[model samples]
Target: GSSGSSGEPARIEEEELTLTILRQTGGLGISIAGGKGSTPYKGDDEGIFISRVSEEGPAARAGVRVGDKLLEVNGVALQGAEHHEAVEALRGAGTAVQMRVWRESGPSSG
Candidate 1:
Protein backbone atom coordinates (compact mmCIF):
# COMPACT_ATOMS: atom_id res chain seq x y z
CA GLY A 1 0.00 0.00 0.00
CA SER A 2 1.87 3.07 -1.24
CA SER A 3 -0.28 5.38 0.85
CA GLY A 4 1.19 8.78 -0.04
CA SER A 5 -1.90 10.68 1.13
CA SER A 6 -2.93 8.95 4.29
CA GLY A 7 -3.42 12.24 6.04
CA GLU A 8 -6.54 13.05 4.01
CA PRO A 9 -9.53 14.18 6.09
CA ALA A 10 -12.65 13.44 4.07
CA ARG A 11 -14.51 10.63 5.73
CA ILE A 12 -17.92 12.20 5.45
CA GLU A 13 -20.68 10.96 3.13
CA GLU A 14 -19.31 7.49 2.72
CA GLU A 15 -20.97 6.09 -0.39
CA GLU A 16 -20.71 2.86 -2.32
CA LEU A 17 -19.30 3.25 -5.80
CA THR A 18 -19.59 0.67 -8.51
CA LEU A 19 -16.93 0.73 -11.18
CA THR A 20 -15.82 -1.62 -13.93
CA ILE A 21 -12.37 -2.03 -15.41
CA LEU A 22 -10.86 -4.01 -18.21
CA ARG A 23 -8.31 -6.38 -16.75
CA GLN A 24 -5.15 -6.08 -18.73
CA THR A 25 -2.63 -8.88 -18.65
CA GLY A 26 -0.60 -6.61 -16.42
CA GLY A 27 -3.36 -6.56 -13.83
CA LEU A 28 -5.66 -3.78 -12.66
CA GLY A 29 -2.81 -1.41 -11.87
CA ILE A 30 -3.98 -0.75 -8.35
CA SER A 31 -2.62 -1.35 -4.89
CA ILE A 32 -4.58 -2.28 -1.80
CA ALA A 33 -3.95 -2.89 1.86
CA GLY A 34 -5.54 -3.76 5.20
CA GLY A 35 -8.18 -6.35 5.95
CA LYS A 36 -10.03 -7.81 8.91
CA GLY A 37 -9.01 -5.96 12.08
CA SER A 38 -6.92 -3.45 10.19
CA THR A 39 -8.83 -1.17 7.84
CA PRO A 40 -7.42 2.16 6.70
CA TYR A 41 -10.11 4.02 8.61
CA LYS A 42 -11.02 3.67 12.28
CA GLY A 43 -10.34 -0.06 11.98
CA ASP A 44 -13.99 -1.07 12.02
CA ASP A 45 -14.39 -2.37 8.46
CA GLU A 46 -12.66 -5.60 7.57
CA GLY A 47 -12.65 -4.94 3.83
CA ILE A 48 -9.57 -4.21 1.79
CA PHE A 49 -9.10 -0.60 0.63
CA ILE A 50 -7.43 0.91 -2.41
CA SER A 51 -4.17 2.63 -1.58
CA ARG A 52 -2.91 3.53 -5.01
CA VAL A 53 -3.86 3.64 -8.70
CA SER A 54 -1.27 3.69 -11.42
CA GLU A 55 -1.50 6.38 -14.05
CA GLU A 56 -2.80 5.27 -17.45
CA GLY A 57 -3.65 1.86 -16.15
CA PRO A 58 -6.95 0.08 -16.35
CA ALA A 59 -7.90 0.99 -12.82
CA ALA A 60 -6.94 4.60 -13.32
CA ARG A 61 -8.88 4.78 -16.57
CA ALA A 62 -11.76 3.16 -14.73
CA GLY A 63 -11.83 5.95 -12.15
CA VAL A 64 -10.20 4.05 -9.32
CA ARG A 65 -8.32 6.09 -6.75
CA VAL A 66 -6.67 5.84 -3.42
CA GLY A 67 -8.84 5.69 -0.28
CA ASP A 68 -11.56 3.69 -2.03
CA LYS A 69 -12.53 0.70 0.07
CA LEU A 70 -13.12 -2.46 -1.96
CA LEU A 71 -16.41 -4.15 -1.22
CA GLU A 72 -16.63 -6.64 -4.08
CA VAL A 73 -14.78 -7.83 -7.14
CA ASN A 74 -16.53 -9.20 -10.23
CA GLY A 75 -19.65 -9.50 -8.04
CA VAL A 76 -17.88 -11.49 -5.35
CA ALA A 77 -18.09 -9.98 -1.90
CA LEU A 78 -14.76 -8.95 -0.41
CA GLN A 79 -16.02 -7.64 2.89
CA GLY A 80 -14.58 -9.30 5.98
CA ALA A 81 -12.12 -11.12 3.75
CA GLU A 82 -8.49 -11.67 4.58
CA HIS A 83 -5.87 -9.71 2.65
CA HIS A 84 -4.64 -12.76 0.77
CA GLU A 85 -8.12 -13.84 -0.20
CA ALA A 86 -9.11 -10.43 -1.47
CA VAL A 87 -5.88 -10.03 -3.42
CA GLU A 88 -6.24 -13.45 -4.94
CA ALA A 89 -9.57 -12.55 -6.43
CA LEU A 90 -8.20 -9.50 -8.22
CA ARG A 91 -5.34 -11.32 -9.85
CA GLY A 92 -7.65 -14.16 -10.72
CA ALA A 93 -9.97 -11.82 -12.54
CA GLY A 94 -10.53 -12.21 -16.25
CA THR A 95 -10.62 -9.65 -19.05
CA ALA A 96 -13.18 -7.56 -17.24
CA VAL A 97 -13.44 -6.86 -13.56
CA GLN A 98 -16.47 -5.27 -11.97
CA MET A 99 -15.88 -3.80 -8.53
CA ARG A 100 -17.73 -1.96 -5.84
CA VAL A 101 -15.96 0.61 -3.69
CA TRP A 102 -16.88 2.57 -0.62
CA ARG A 103 -15.59 6.12 -0.29
CA GLU A 104 -16.46 9.67 0.63
CA SER A 105 -18.80 11.38 -1.80
CA GLY A 106 -21.08 14.38 -1.47
CA PRO A 107 -23.17 16.61 -3.76
CA SER A 108 -21.86 14.98 -6.93
CA SER A 109 -18.78 13.18 -8.16
CA GLY A 110 -15.89 14.62 -6.23
Candidate 2:
Protein backbone atom coordinates (compact mmCIF):
# COMPACT_ATOMS: atom_id res chain seq x y z
CA GLY A 1 0.00 0.00 0.00
CA SER A 2 2.98 2.28 0.38
CA SER A 3 4.35 1.91 -3.15
CA GLY A 4 3.89 4.70 -5.73
CA SER A 5 2.37 4.25 -9.13
CA SER A 6 5.78 4.37 -10.84
CA GLY A 7 7.00 1.47 -8.67
CA GLU A 8 9.44 3.70 -6.79
CA PRO A 9 10.72 2.77 -3.36
CA ALA A 10 8.26 3.26 -0.55
CA ARG A 11 8.76 6.43 1.39
CA ILE A 12 7.51 7.45 4.80
CA GLU A 13 6.69 11.03 5.61
CA GLU A 14 5.86 12.91 8.81
CA GLU A 15 4.33 16.39 8.79
CA GLU A 16 4.11 17.72 12.38
CA LEU A 17 5.90 16.97 15.66
CA THR A 18 6.08 17.91 19.35
CA LEU A 19 8.92 19.21 21.56
CA THR A 20 9.18 20.24 25.18
CA ILE A 21 11.27 22.97 26.82
CA LEU A 22 12.02 23.95 30.39
CA ARG A 23 10.88 27.21 31.99
CA GLN A 24 12.47 30.57 31.19
CA THR A 25 11.48 34.22 31.59
CA GLY A 26 12.42 35.24 28.06
CA GLY A 27 10.40 32.38 26.75
CA LEU A 28 12.78 30.23 24.71
CA GLY A 29 15.20 32.88 23.61
CA ILE A 30 14.81 31.51 20.10
CA SER A 31 14.04 33.42 16.92
CA ILE A 32 11.16 32.30 14.72
CA ALA A 33 10.76 32.58 10.94
CA GLY A 34 8.89 31.20 7.88
CA GLY A 35 5.26 32.08 8.32
CA LYS A 36 2.86 33.27 5.58
CA GLY A 37 4.93 33.06 2.36
CA SER A 38 8.25 31.48 3.18
CA THR A 39 9.21 27.89 2.58
CA PRO A 40 8.66 25.38 5.34
CA TYR A 41 11.32 24.62 7.94
CA LYS A 42 14.14 22.13 7.55
CA GLY A 43 13.19 19.56 10.18
CA ASP A 44 9.55 20.23 10.81
CA ASP A 45 7.74 21.78 7.85
CA GLU A 46 4.22 22.35 9.09
CA GLY A 47 4.56 25.41 11.30
CA ILE A 48 7.08 28.24 11.57
CA PHE A 49 10.76 27.40 11.92
CA ILE A 50 13.17 28.51 14.62
CA SER A 51 15.60 30.81 12.83
CA ARG A 52 18.05 31.23 15.67
CA VAL A 53 18.79 30.25 19.24
CA SER A 54 20.74 32.52 21.51
CA GLU A 55 23.95 30.84 22.56
CA GLU A 56 23.66 31.76 26.22
CA GLY A 57 19.89 31.41 26.44
CA PRO A 58 17.90 28.66 28.02
CA ALA A 59 16.77 27.46 24.61
CA ALA A 60 20.30 26.66 23.57
CA ARG A 61 20.95 24.99 26.89
CA ALA A 62 17.78 22.96 26.49
CA GLY A 63 18.83 21.88 22.97
CA VAL A 64 16.65 24.10 20.77
CA ARG A 65 18.44 25.01 17.57
CA VAL A 66 18.04 26.82 14.28
CA GLY A 67 15.96 25.07 11.60
CA ASP A 68 13.75 23.34 14.14
CA LYS A 69 10.08 23.92 13.28
CA LEU A 70 7.68 25.03 16.00
CA LEU A 71 4.07 23.83 15.84
CA GLU A 72 2.38 24.81 19.08
CA VAL A 73 2.83 26.64 22.37
CA ASN A 74 1.24 25.38 25.59
CA GLY A 75 -0.81 23.10 23.28
CA VAL A 76 -2.17 26.00 21.19
CA ALA A 77 -1.27 25.69 17.51
CA LEU A 78 0.78 28.43 15.88
CA GLN A 79 -0.18 27.45 12.35
CA GLY A 80 -1.59 30.84 11.26
CA ALA A 81 -0.06 33.04 13.93
CA GLU A 82 1.61 36.26 12.87
CA HIS A 83 5.10 37.16 14.01
CA HIS A 84 3.90 39.53 16.67
CA GLU A 85 1.13 37.20 17.76
CA ALA A 86 3.56 34.36 18.18
CA VAL A 87 5.82 36.56 20.25
CA GLU A 88 2.92 37.67 22.37
CA ALA A 89 1.93 34.12 23.09
CA LEU A 90 5.40 33.22 24.18
CA ARG A 91 5.55 36.26 26.39
CA GLY A 92 2.22 35.39 27.96
CA ALA A 93 3.17 31.83 28.67
CA GLY A 94 4.85 32.80 31.93
CA THR A 95 7.97 31.15 33.26
CA ALA A 96 7.14 27.59 32.19
CA VAL A 97 5.64 26.61 28.86
CA GLN A 98 5.45 23.56 26.69
CA MET A 99 6.34 23.84 23.00
CA ARG A 100 5.89 21.37 20.21
CA VAL A 101 8.48 21.24 17.44
CA TRP A 102 9.34 19.09 14.45
CA ARG A 103 12.95 18.11 13.81
CA GLU A 104 14.45 16.37 10.80
CA SER A 105 15.99 12.96 11.03
CA GLY A 106 19.62 14.03 10.70
CA PRO A 107 21.54 16.60 12.72
CA SER A 108 21.06 20.15 11.43
CA SER A 109 24.14 21.97 10.07
CA GLY A 110 25.06 25.64 10.20
Candidate 3:
Protein backbone atom coordinates (compact mmCIF):
# COMPACT_ATOMS: atom_id res chain seq x y z
CA GLY A 1 0.00 0.00 0.00
CA SER A 2 1.24 3.42 -0.94
CA SER A 3 0.03 6.77 0.40
CA GLY A 4 -0.15 9.84 -1.79
CA SER A 5 0.72 13.17 -0.21
CA SER A 6 -1.25 16.18 -1.36
CA GLY A 7 0.20 19.32 0.19
CA GLU A 8 -2.20 22.16 0.87
CA PRO A 9 -2.19 25.05 3.28
CA ALA A 10 -4.79 24.90 6.00
CA ARG A 11 -7.50 27.52 6.16
CA ILE A 12 -7.92 29.49 9.34
CA GLU A 13 -10.50 32.06 10.36
CA GLU A 14 -9.35 35.18 12.15
CA GLU A 15 -12.16 36.73 14.10
CA GLU A 16 -12.46 39.65 16.44
CA LEU A 17 -12.73 39.01 20.17
CA THR A 18 -15.70 40.59 21.86
CA LEU A 19 -16.80 39.92 25.39
CA THR A 20 -19.64 41.38 27.42
CA ILE A 21 -18.91 41.35 31.09
CA LEU A 22 -21.35 41.78 33.94
CA ARG A 23 -19.95 44.39 36.24
CA GLN A 24 -19.01 43.30 39.68
CA THR A 25 -19.19 45.28 42.86
CA GLY A 26 -15.49 45.68 43.40
CA GLY A 27 -13.88 45.69 39.97
CA LEU A 28 -13.12 43.69 36.85
CA GLY A 29 -10.04 42.24 38.53
CA ILE A 30 -7.85 42.53 35.45
CA SER A 31 -4.70 44.58 35.19
CA ILE A 32 -3.99 46.73 32.18
CA ALA A 33 -0.48 47.27 30.85
CA GLY A 34 1.32 48.54 27.73
CA GLY A 35 1.36 52.31 27.72
CA LYS A 36 3.92 55.07 27.15
CA GLY A 37 6.49 53.55 29.50
CA SER A 38 5.63 49.97 28.58
CA THR A 39 6.15 48.24 25.26
CA PRO A 40 4.82 50.30 22.40
CA TYR A 41 2.89 48.67 19.62
CA LYS A 42 4.79 49.41 16.39
CA GLY A 43 5.47 52.94 17.69
CA ASP A 44 1.86 53.76 16.91
CA ASP A 45 0.24 50.91 18.76
CA GLU A 46 -2.16 52.24 21.32
CA GLY A 47 -3.88 49.06 22.43
CA ILE A 48 -3.48 48.21 26.10
CA PHE A 49 -2.67 44.62 26.96
CA ILE A 50 -4.08 42.65 29.83
CA SER A 51 -1.15 42.31 32.18
CA ARG A 52 -2.59 40.13 34.96
CA VAL A 53 -5.90 38.72 36.11
CA SER A 54 -7.04 37.83 39.56
CA GLU A 55 -7.69 34.14 39.91
CA GLU A 56 -11.18 34.58 41.32
CA GLY A 57 -11.90 38.08 40.16
CA PRO A 58 -14.93 39.19 38.19
CA ALA A 59 -12.87 39.25 35.00
CA ALA A 60 -11.82 35.65 35.48
CA ARG A 61 -15.38 34.74 36.25
CA ALA A 62 -16.44 36.48 33.07
CA GLY A 63 -13.93 34.37 31.10
CA VAL A 64 -11.65 37.30 30.47
CA ARG A 65 -8.29 35.66 30.02
CA VAL A 66 -4.90 37.17 30.52
CA GLY A 67 -2.83 38.40 27.58
CA ASP A 68 -5.94 39.78 25.93
CA LYS A 69 -5.46 43.09 24.19
CA LEU A 70 -8.22 45.45 25.26
CA LEU A 71 -9.38 47.55 22.36
CA GLU A 72 -12.59 49.01 23.69
CA VAL A 73 -14.83 49.08 26.70
CA ASN A 74 -18.53 49.87 26.79
CA GLY A 75 -18.31 50.95 23.16
CA VAL A 76 -15.46 53.38 23.89
CA ALA A 77 -12.18 52.85 22.11
CA LEU A 78 -9.08 52.47 24.18
CA GLN A 79 -6.73 53.21 21.33
CA GLY A 80 -4.29 55.96 22.33
CA ALA A 81 -6.30 56.38 25.51
CA GLU A 82 -4.48 57.33 28.68
CA HIS A 83 -4.28 54.97 31.62
CA HIS A 84 -6.63 57.06 33.70
CA GLU A 85 -8.99 57.34 30.77
CA ALA A 86 -9.13 53.63 30.27
CA VAL A 87 -9.62 53.09 33.99
CA GLU A 88 -12.45 55.55 34.01
CA ALA A 89 -14.16 53.83 31.15
CA LEU A 90 -13.93 50.49 32.86
CA ARG A 91 -15.09 51.94 36.13
CA GLY A 92 -18.02 53.64 34.47
CA ALA A 93 -19.38 50.32 33.37
CA GLY A 94 -21.83 49.87 36.19
CA THR A 95 -23.99 46.81 35.55
CA ALA A 96 -22.57 45.38 32.36
CA VAL A 97 -19.76 46.26 30.01
CA GLN A 98 -19.04 45.21 26.51
CA MET A 99 -15.33 44.71 25.91
CA ARG A 100 -13.70 44.27 22.57
CA VAL A 101 -10.34 42.61 22.71
CA TRP A 102 -7.79 40.92 20.46
CA ARG A 103 -6.69 37.45 21.38
CA GLU A 104 -3.67 36.08 19.60
CA SER A 105 -4.04 32.65 18.14
CA GLY A 106 -1.45 29.93 17.87
CA PRO A 107 -0.89 27.30 15.16
CA SER A 108 -3.95 26.46 13.11
CA SER A 109 -5.98 23.56 14.38
CA GLY A 110 -6.44 22.36 10.88
Per-residue lDDT over 25-110 for candidate 1, one digit per residue giving the tens place of the 0 to 100 score: 86789888887656544256556888788897999988987778898999888887787888888877899889899876644454
Residue-level lDDT of model 2, residues 7-56, one tens digit each, is 66776543455555666454577888766555545434435778888898
Question: Candidate 3's residue-wise lDDT over 1-110, tens digit each?
Answer: 87979879886653458887776576688888765545654345666777788887777777776667788898988876777777888887877878887765653332
Highest-scoring model, TM-score: 1
Q: Provide the lDDT at 40 for model 2.
A: 49
TM-score of every candidate relative to the true structure: 0.75, 0.67, 0.71
Task: Mark the regions of model 2 whose C-alpha exceeds 4 Å error after superposition.
Answer: 1-16, 37-47, 108-110
User: In terms of lDDT, which candidate is stronger, 1 or 3?
Assistant: 1
For model 3, what is the C-alpha lDDT against the true structure? 0.73
Rate residue 37 of model 3 by lDDT: 47
lDDT of 2 at 75: 76
Every candidate's lDDT: 0.80, 0.68, 0.73
Ten residues in sequence with the least summed lDDT for candidate 1:
37-46
Q: What order do candidates take by lDDT, descending?
A: 1, 3, 2
